[PDB]
Amino acid sequence: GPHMATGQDRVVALVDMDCFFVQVEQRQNPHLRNKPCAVVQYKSWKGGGIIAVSYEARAFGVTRSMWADDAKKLCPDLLLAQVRESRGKANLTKYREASVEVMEIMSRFAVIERASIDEAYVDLTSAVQERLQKLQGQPISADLLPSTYIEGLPQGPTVQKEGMRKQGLFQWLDSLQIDNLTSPDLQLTVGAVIVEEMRAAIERETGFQCSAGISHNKVLAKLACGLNKPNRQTLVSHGSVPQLFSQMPIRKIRSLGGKLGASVIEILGIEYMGELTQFTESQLQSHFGEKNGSWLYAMCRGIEHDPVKPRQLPKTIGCSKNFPGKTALATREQVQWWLLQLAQELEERLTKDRNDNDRVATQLVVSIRVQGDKRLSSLRRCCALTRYDAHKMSHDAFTVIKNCNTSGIQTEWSPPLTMLFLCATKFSAS
Template identity: 65%
Template sequence: MEAATARVVALVDMDCFYVQVEQRLRPELRKKPVVVAQYKTWKGGGIIAVSYEARAFGVSRNMFANDAKKLCADLQIARVREAHGKADLSKYREASVEVMEIMSRFAVVERASIDEVYIDLSDSVRKRIQEMAGRIIPEEALKSTFVHGYPHLQPTEEQNTTKEDLRRLGVQHWLDSLHFGDLRSPELQLTVGAIIVEEMRAAVEEETTFQCSAGISHNKILAKLSCGLNKPNRQTILPQSSVPALFSQLPIGKM
């Protein structure tokens, strides 16, 4: 068990990254149903990125742009440049480099794709915990964080509890359970890792306008799985104690 919880690893995924790159270039596209398509010789081209506004109409990746227009008449289509008959992804790659440079200030990063990065937070977490010297972590330090499996008791439907209410309640219960004097506590290490990722994501948005989601756990697979639990622009801690419950509910296809 000690070996399984020895590291703190995050997976950061840029939300609809190609769409965000296009929206930064054309601010009028923000908060609108937008897709990014490449090659338009067949049915308007294939869609490779979809904004959350467009997803609400049933538009999805790998759909053809002309078919997507039938689902959403107001759909805005941004097109990938072509060079020598091939898709030119240079502006997305350059934007990705911007993000990676910012993230690398906080911890060791490993690019997983143009819009995903794994981060080994282990050393940064240990250093931060020593600097904290046992101080209590305020709830405000985890303002966009969910803790999977918390709160343990879900409110009833009659209580009209929102997802944000549940998030805050879960964070409160999680923080109440921590032993701040135990510097080797895996739960404390995950929490400090989440604080660092909160700071990292805020820096990315401030300097590039790009928003991202993240998962924080003890290895790459768990970080990847937890990243997708509360998108967009949110992050999720997956503690070891919550892994069995997650796996019992997770379709095998997700693995």
């Protein structure tokens, strides 16, 4: 009772851009705005692979990983923007630049953890404390939370979405105990006020809309964010967790979407996150290991301790290209030319990184995939990254992988390569 931690010590938010690459293209080309629209990579094979989809197009069944030709069958008037192609590969520079726009704005409110090209966590615990003491003790008006959902409300004793949102928010605010600065529900609420302000600033200064989750930890914040996309934010209180998790498939929890989540389901014979509470910590540790067991024991109770890391920049800079089926690289000269293309993009991004961020990469990781191998990587080799020079980087990459070539002859490569991947790592201050 008095000694059992409830995991309510922090206020954490996750902000994620709505259909991000689509919004980047819609900002640039007004003709695409408020329309079913998707962003695709390449064009020749089946119209291009879709990697982002406007909410208007999602209503037709268009999804990520769909070929554009197939999406067009679902949505004949679907509009398409293609990712820039440079040196024969996809070039995502425009979206990396848009990302920096958003991250730099979020950084004004608190130190962020950049978690992807379009989302960041923020620890608002301190900001919340300062806002609480400076609002004197005033109650929090619903007007300060104009796009906020309270997960689980309304409950108990309007048939349209906005009406439901407000009734839930009203129930929540009417119940708040604003006289107690230590109340976690209050801290979350103030967090939500701050996130409304953050999201307003993002939209005002970039034109991009986003959604957000506010909770006590990263996993719940991320989950909350998704509950009411697009252009809304969701507060998941500690109190909301039992009902929320009681019907929540285990795979919806980040890190559980793969084989670990599958084994939890199979070994324990359960479906929902809440069902995990039945097991002792030792029981979970026995099935899934010490780290996973402890994590699962706490997580099914809404508790997680992973900190928001002070990290606004990516830890690695990399680029890759697949060469599927018949396009697999089967000659020495081919392998070298594409290593050079990848290396040239990497040099330009590295040089820009050094100027912007006062750091230099010191290690180069070369990854390949061979024909027949379904793994992401068949083989990885590293070498020193001592100069931002594409010819040197590509030559060095060839050197460390050249012995994979089981060909007898000079100019051929066997088995043919279905992927090349250069990744610059181990940054140092410069």
